[PDB]
Amino acid sequence: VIKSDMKIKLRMEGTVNGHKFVIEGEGEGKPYEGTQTMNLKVKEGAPLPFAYDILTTVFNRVFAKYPKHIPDYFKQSFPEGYSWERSMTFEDGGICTARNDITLEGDCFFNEIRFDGVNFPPNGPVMQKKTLKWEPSTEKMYVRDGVLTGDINMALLLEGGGHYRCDFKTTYKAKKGVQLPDYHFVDHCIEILSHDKDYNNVKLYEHAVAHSGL
Amino acid sequence: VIKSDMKIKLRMEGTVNGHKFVIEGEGEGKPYEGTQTMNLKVKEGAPLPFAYDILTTVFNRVFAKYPKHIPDYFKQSFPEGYSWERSMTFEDGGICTARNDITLEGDCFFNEIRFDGVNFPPNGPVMQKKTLKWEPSTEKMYVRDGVLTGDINMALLLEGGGHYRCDFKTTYKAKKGVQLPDYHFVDHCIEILSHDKDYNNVKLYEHAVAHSGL
Amino acid sequence: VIKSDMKIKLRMEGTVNGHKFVIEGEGEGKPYEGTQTMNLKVKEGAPLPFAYDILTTVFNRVFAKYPKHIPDYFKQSFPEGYSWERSMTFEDGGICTARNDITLEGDCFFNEIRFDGVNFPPNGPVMQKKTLKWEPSTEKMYVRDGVLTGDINMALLLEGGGHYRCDFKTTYKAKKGVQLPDYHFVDHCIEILSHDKDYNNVKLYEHAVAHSGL
Amino acid sequence: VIKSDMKIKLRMEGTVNGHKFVIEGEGEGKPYEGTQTMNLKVKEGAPLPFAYDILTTVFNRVFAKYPKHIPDYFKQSFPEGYSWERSMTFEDGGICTARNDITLEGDCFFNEIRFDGVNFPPNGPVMQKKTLKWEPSTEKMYVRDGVLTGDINMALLLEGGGHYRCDFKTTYKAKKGVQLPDYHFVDHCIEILSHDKDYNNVKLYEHAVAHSGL
Secondary structure, three states: OOOOOOOEEEEEEEEEOOOEEEEEEEEEEEEEEEEOOOOOOOOOOOOOOOOOOHHHHHOOOOOOOOOOOOHHHHHOOOOOOOEEEEEEEOOOOEEEEEEEEEEEOOOOEEEEEEEEEEEEOOOOOOOOOOOOEOOHHHHHHEEEOOHHHHEEEEEEEEOOOOOEEEEEEEEEEEEEOOOOOEEEEEEEEEEEEEEEEOOOOOEEEEEEEOOOOO | OOOOEEEEEEEEEEEEEOOOEEEEEEEEEEOOOOEEEEEEEEEEOOOOOOOOOHHHOOOOOOOOOOOOOOHHHHHHHHOOOEEEEEEEOOOOEEEEEEEEEEEEOOOOEEEEEEEEOOOOOOOOOOOOOOEEEEEEEEEEEEOOOOOOEEEEEEEEEOOOEEEEEEEEEEEEEEEEOOOOOOOOOEEEEEEEEEEEOOOOEEEEEEEEEOOOOO | OOOOOOOOOOOEEEEEEOOEEEEEEEEEOOOOOOOEEEEEEEEOOOOOOOOOHHHHHHOOOOEEOOOOOOOOHHHHHHOEEEEEEEEEEEEOEEEEEEEEEEEOOEEEEEEEEEEEEEOOOOOOOOOOOOOOOOOOEEEEEEEEEOOOEEEEEEEEEOOOOOEEEEEEEEEOOOOOOOOOOEEEEEEEEEEEEEEEEOEEEEEEEEEEEOOOOO | OOOOOOEEEEEEEEEOEEEEEEEEEEEEEEOOOOEEEEEEEEEEEEOOOOHHHHHHHHHHOOEEEEOOOOOOOOHHHHOOEEEEEEEEEEEOOOEEEEEEEEEOOOOEEEEEEEEEOOOOOOOOOOOOEEEEEEEEEEEEEEEEEEEEEEEEEEEEEEEEOOOEEEEEEEEEEOOOOOOOOOEEEEEEEEEEEEEEOOOEEEEEEEEEEEEEOO
């Protein structure tokens, strides 16, 4: 059962620009307020040679405030749960694929995550670590072949002001039948609360609220 | 000077799938409430053989409610005014280019518009007229090389429920120096209020509100 | 009837970055050797403020050497003839749409052409005129919904060596039924033979040879 | 040293549509004739629930016939060797990322490969196994930030004739300084010679020839 306070555990294995890494995270959140925080620790591949920000949005749409009038694809899916797949296409040709298989055991969400990144330019903001944060965003959610897709126009703020664009397309797949939502939106804001020098340690917060637009 | 009630006049010349057309419109709006309505009349190329909806978002971001804390690129640009260029990339490979050069004379906005569409599949929703409306959207606005870009994940609702995606990228260019806004959003909803059988006559409404996200 | 020497006449009307222009061309070619040359003259909008090279590949696949074993979509279509539509998507977000409606009258191909370009960055190679030529290419031709598509990975050579990529997708539509070709290729090389300082006058050559690959 | 007959060993680990798998291959080739063959055996994740063809072009551009006038980026890189990264963007939104780190030991090329695929539609040709083969192709090779990129318009032939497009962008990175080639092409043909019912066993051939175009 999904309570008002829930715990998060995760392990991400991945490779960006040939660099292998493993990251583990523990935290907690409030599913009905659409908030969560976690602490993340690089287990292998430190120091990461790329912008930590490309990972952060991979680190669960259960953590979203859903109003009564929009069916909540994520909450309805448990105890069985759900998985997602995502591509991230950056404007200079960097591409990431990502996935998360989310299970519930007691009061804790377990997150098995793969992340893979290719074709980032050597002098781009990713490989030179010139990103500051992701701007807030609005994810456009709709049903396509019986599952939920979310598309997002994401943007990283860069050093010197200036933006670097990435398009997300995520497919969310419930492991049981649930009532499918009509087209709707989820506003997102995501923030690195703290970190140490090489991002070996990172405290990371998210707020998500689902809505119907104007 | 931009007053609380302003008038709209326009002429669009274009070609979609080889089909030439001319459309003229007259209407009015409230720039500070971010609302406008117009009546449109096909002058040449009737009956249009494609979904009228691909044109509608081409039929002025002056008509947007801007809160005090976000510089209003569009209003600041007058009396001199501004122009925009847009590409629309549809998910089945249909591409449109569009432009509007906007002038102010008295209480009336004049809009000189070109629209061009290519590579729509013969059995796609556009050429078969299977679109119902554009979902509301949120445009992500940011400065790039000293002018304003807006990117949007747009979606047409189709007959049978089901969606058809299009990505908009618009470059907005003021004809004088204005104070540039930080990254921000504009929510949009657009609606065909009425039309006759072949869309020779169309009454078209828009609401736009600029904001800073979560 | 399509003879071994044929003549070319054309008029292109278009707008790039807001700049309106008209170009007319006359030349000639050898349809069965897959060669053609033309002289082009800017009629309106001189001096063009963008790289002339973005137009050149818009200035007829009749001019292609087709071996016996691949049906020749272009030649088979006359006397009735054919039209095409093209999008050109550049790697920095510049997009062009283009079209040509091709008629035969006597020994002369008439070409009615529209060209429209948007969202070229102010300091990009297009607006700064930093292009040198298009590399040769290979167009991948295939049938899709009963008409012929060609896709191409095009690249402009830039000043300083260095390349600027553009993807072409063209839909070719015969005005009668013809025997449809299986997947095949057309190699292309295109060359500005001469021009005057502001490209008001341009001599332009093309060679095209269709083939079946390795 | 790269001799006229060379051996191939490889291991691919990957996940497509959530399905984990491991494949190992052994074979051999002629680097200067640009030919190679290998036998592949699914070690984990049998039976694969997706079209084996999406993997095949991931299963070394050392195996390419390079004429004297084009510097051979791949051969020049050994004994040190090289790695590549690739994205594959399919026309219905399926995306794969891939990589290969290639080492030389004695007469044998070792290939450490990761493959990851997301967002393939449930009724698309990939998940329904409706692919027949990759058409031959031509890869456009050019230098970008001091390393070699190859772009390709790939197409799978489908059951019922009909094609399914994928764009490849690969970054090839030599592990020492080599003489960089000018823009050039590599023609490719790739063929499943034999396989058993569930593609647990696959015999796979490639021919690659580098050239300068028309």
